[PDB]
């Protein structure tokens, strides 16, 4: 449970008496604890928003250099200037006029033509890929709150061999999933992928190991050279003048110089955008949203035919309060009497032991039959003073507690 009960964004959704549907909102880095009447407590959390098979739409260049700068000029009324490289699309040229005359190698004064080209090479580029609901896939983790060892589970590693933890996946074309939770029944998951986000107005952008989600219109209006899609060898760049400028032209020459790298200029424009991961051809997200419906009628308690744990418990840690007011208590059970139902409650009247508040780990059950087993619990106490009562009989455990 630990990663769920230590998270800051933890919503508490409650079921019904015998209800079968509850609504949940699943955001990244957050957990939803779903409690129900006479049902085990299950944790829901969205762990992986990932996109794949994105269509490359347009690639912009943000750093470049030139080569093979050649020029050609002709006298006034001697016709337009021409270079062999003027037709090459890998070269960028610029027509211009410059004063010529008798001391400049011509027979009549006036302005004559002049063209200067340069081979266009792009140091680094960025790519904008398109995203469609045919690319989304959400991964939700379904864990059981209180299986006597979830108090030592902190992450997803090892969830395959753990029957109390199930992993499901959701796509917009397949928004449903079902999985078994071991001896705690099974869980249903009907999710709305439309309420996730608006992924028809955005592009997935990659630039030098950094990746964002950017608006479609902001991406079109970027003033940089660009091609459509991608191509092997050398593709055709459009609007090469965004990085190449032509400076003051002498009577037979023109200085070609490139602008500085525009990487930092793009970073400053991507301050408010969402940052994303890159895993090969797949894209990974850490900022999303998910409204889902939980089918909990198939959830069940682990064995209720068990007997109450008759041996004596001992505190292993000192009870600590969580960020949500709940108390975590870790206990050690010295009994060897098989699996047994853990007697745990909160009683404001120590003589009648009438329950106040509730347990977050509903119906805790020691499943080990060896001495000195450990189990961590969680309790939602009432405000003010109340007694944590764990166990039965003489050696029962009492720890005073106050909640604001």
């Amino acid at each position, epitope marked *: 449970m630990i990663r769920c009960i230590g998270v800051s964004n933890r919503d508490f959704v409650e079921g019904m008496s015998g209800g079968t549907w509850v609504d949940v909102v699943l955001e990244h880095g957050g957990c939803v604890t779903v409690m129900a009447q006479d049902k085990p407590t299950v944790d829901i959390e969205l762990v*992986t928003t990932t996109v794949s098979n994105m269509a490359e739409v347009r690639s912009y260049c943000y750093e470049a250099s030139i080569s093979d700068m050649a020029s050609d000029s002709r006298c006034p009324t001697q016709g337009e200037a021409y270079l062999d490289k003027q037709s090459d699309t890998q070269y960028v040229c610029k027509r211009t006029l410059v004063n010529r005359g008798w001391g400049t190698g011509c027979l009549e004064w006036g302005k004559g033509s002049l063209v200067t080209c340069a081979k266009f090479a792009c140091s680094k580029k960025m790519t904008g890929k398109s995203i469609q609901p045919e690319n989304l896939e959400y991964r939700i983790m379904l864990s059981v709150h209180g299986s006597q060892h979830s108090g030592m589970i902190v992450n997803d*590693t*090892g969830h395959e061999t753990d029957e109390n933890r199930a992993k499901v996946e959701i796509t917009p074309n397949s928004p449903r999933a079902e999985a078994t939770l071991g001896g705690f029944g099974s869980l249903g998951l009907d999710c709305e992928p439309r309420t996730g986000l608006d992924f028809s107005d955005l592009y997935y952008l990659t630039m030098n190991n950094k990746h964002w989600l950017v608006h479609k219109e902001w991406f079109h209006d970027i003033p940089l050279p660009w091609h459509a899609g991608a191509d092997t060898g050398t593709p055709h760049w459009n609007n090469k003048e965004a990085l190449v400028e032509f400076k003051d032209a002498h009577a037979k020459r023109q200085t070609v110089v490139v602008l500085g790298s525009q990487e930092g200029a793009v970073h400053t424009a991507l301050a408010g955008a969402l940052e994303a*991961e*890159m*895993d*090969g051809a*797949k894209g990974r997200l850490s900022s999303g949203h998910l409204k889902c419906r939980l089918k909990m009628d198939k959830l069940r308690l682990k064995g209720v035919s068990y007997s109450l744990c008759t041996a004596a418990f001992t505190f292993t840690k000192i009870p600590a309060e969580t960020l949500h007011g709940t108390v975590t208590v870790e206990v050690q059970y010295a009994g060897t009497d098989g699996p047994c139902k853990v007697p745990a409650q909160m009683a404001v009247d120590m003589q009648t032991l009438t329950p106040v508040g509730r347990l977050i780990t509903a119906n805790p059950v020691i499943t080990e039959s060896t001495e000195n087993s450990k189990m961590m619990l969680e309790l939602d106490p009432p405000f003010g003073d109340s007694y944590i009562v764990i166990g039965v009989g003489e050696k029962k455990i009492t720890h005073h507690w106050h909640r604001s």
Partner: antibody
Amino acid sequence: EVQLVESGGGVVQPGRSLRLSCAASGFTFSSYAMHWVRQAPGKGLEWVAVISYDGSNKYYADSVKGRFTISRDNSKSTLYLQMNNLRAEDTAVYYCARDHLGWSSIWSAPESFLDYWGQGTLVTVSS
Amino acid sequence: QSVLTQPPSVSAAPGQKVTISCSGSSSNIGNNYVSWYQQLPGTAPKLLIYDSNKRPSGIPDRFSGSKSGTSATLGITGLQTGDEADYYCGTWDSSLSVWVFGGGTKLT
């Protein structure tokens, strides 16, 4: 246009070493994790090694643990596999394979699958 | 005999539905993504099915990938004489921390 060219494999004696190479082109090599898969003549496929995009994570098959070593130079877009202390059973046609992911997450290894394969390089151990 | 086991040899008449299946454990096929590969005789392996239900662009709809329980099955509806090859399944094993292949299945 994607292509992988394996090279560096001939006939070698047991106990000695060998270094293979896989030339990558047509994709950002530094962005994708890469694998080695060998196949003995007339046998099944056997996965050998994997290296992530930044070369930080490496996993080997139990048969070659500690004896092989996968490595990569993202600058020149090449893949190296250092096989030393060989045996007669290591004779196989070795393929390098591109993985759809760069292995930059906990969920990369499960989602992993080998995207593009090379052509092979017949390594033979005779004695 | 191997981390994943598929039949060594299956044969179907041309123009008929044939299926091939490999089974593993809860650590390889149960949770992780199963992929298939077609190795035509004397050729390099060829990615056939990824994400356990999806066809790469170019593979005809004669092929189909499924996954139920801890065992994924390959599908070939309307076999043709150009499909005779060896077929391998494989995925990542989480308990072994080692990528594993299937035994292979020469189709006839």
